[PDB]
């Protein structure tokens, strides 16, 4: 037993992470600026132990994975650690999807999609 | 925005608005789905609140969760307590005295006997 956060209320607390969907379908820029609105930035993944849950996650949602032409980094600048996401093909593009299990998504960034906050 | 803690909740559980969730997908009749949930110091899934647990908008697929018929024909939680109005539409799927929590609060009833994945919550 232990005392999850802090999050805010409308988020799910897990693992002192917070996340929240949005069933808003907008680009990834766009997805981007709600998250920072939030005080928050995209689903970062950055761990299998501490983020088990993202295994429950169903269908497909925008997390901060970008590629500027370099390998792929999250939105604070951070590479993306090794064997942590299956990477897959799937539209010509820059950004990334999340999908069930630790799948990541090569996607157009101006293709709209619901999409995942993260805070911590 | 305001930050809150949740909880508390057992580490491997989601919180939301302070309570616990865990889903477990390996199948089990409604009885034994309870026996699981109570060996971990929970009951099955218990729908008090769209506001509270508007979480569960997000919950698909068809989970046990701990509501009954008892045939003087009320309908109850595996705590003994009423279902409140205004909380889920209650559908027949198989003749049966339980019920399957599916989104958007909705209840299909289902025969406690069959094995479905089920949800705990932390009570
Ligand atoms: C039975 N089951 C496992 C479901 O139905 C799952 N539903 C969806 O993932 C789900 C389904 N439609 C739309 C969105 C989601 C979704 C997306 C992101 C998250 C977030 F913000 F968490 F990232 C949460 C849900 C599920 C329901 C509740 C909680 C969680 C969990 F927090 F554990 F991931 C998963």
């Known amino acids: 037993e232990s005392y999850c956060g802090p999050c805010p209320k409308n988020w799910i607390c897990y693992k002192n992470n917070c ?4 069933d808003e379908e907008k680009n990834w820029y766009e997805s981007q600026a709600s ?61 990334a999807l999340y999908a069930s299990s630790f799948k990541g998504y090569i996607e157009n960034c101006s293709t709209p999609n619901t999409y995942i906050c993260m805070q911590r």
Not at 19 to 22: I, L
Not at 37 to 43: C, D, G, K, P, V
Not at 53 to 60: C, E, G, I, R, T
């Open 35 to 95: 998250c920072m609105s939030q005080n928050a930035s995209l689903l970062k993944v950055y761990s299998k132990e501490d983020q088990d849950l993202l295994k429950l996650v169903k269908s497909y949602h925008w997390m901060g994975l970008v590629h500027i032409p370099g390998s792929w980094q999250w939105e604070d600048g951070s590479s993306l650690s090794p064997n942590l996401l299956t990477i897959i093909e799937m539209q010509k593009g820059d950004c």
């Open 19 to 22: 996340y929240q969907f949005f």
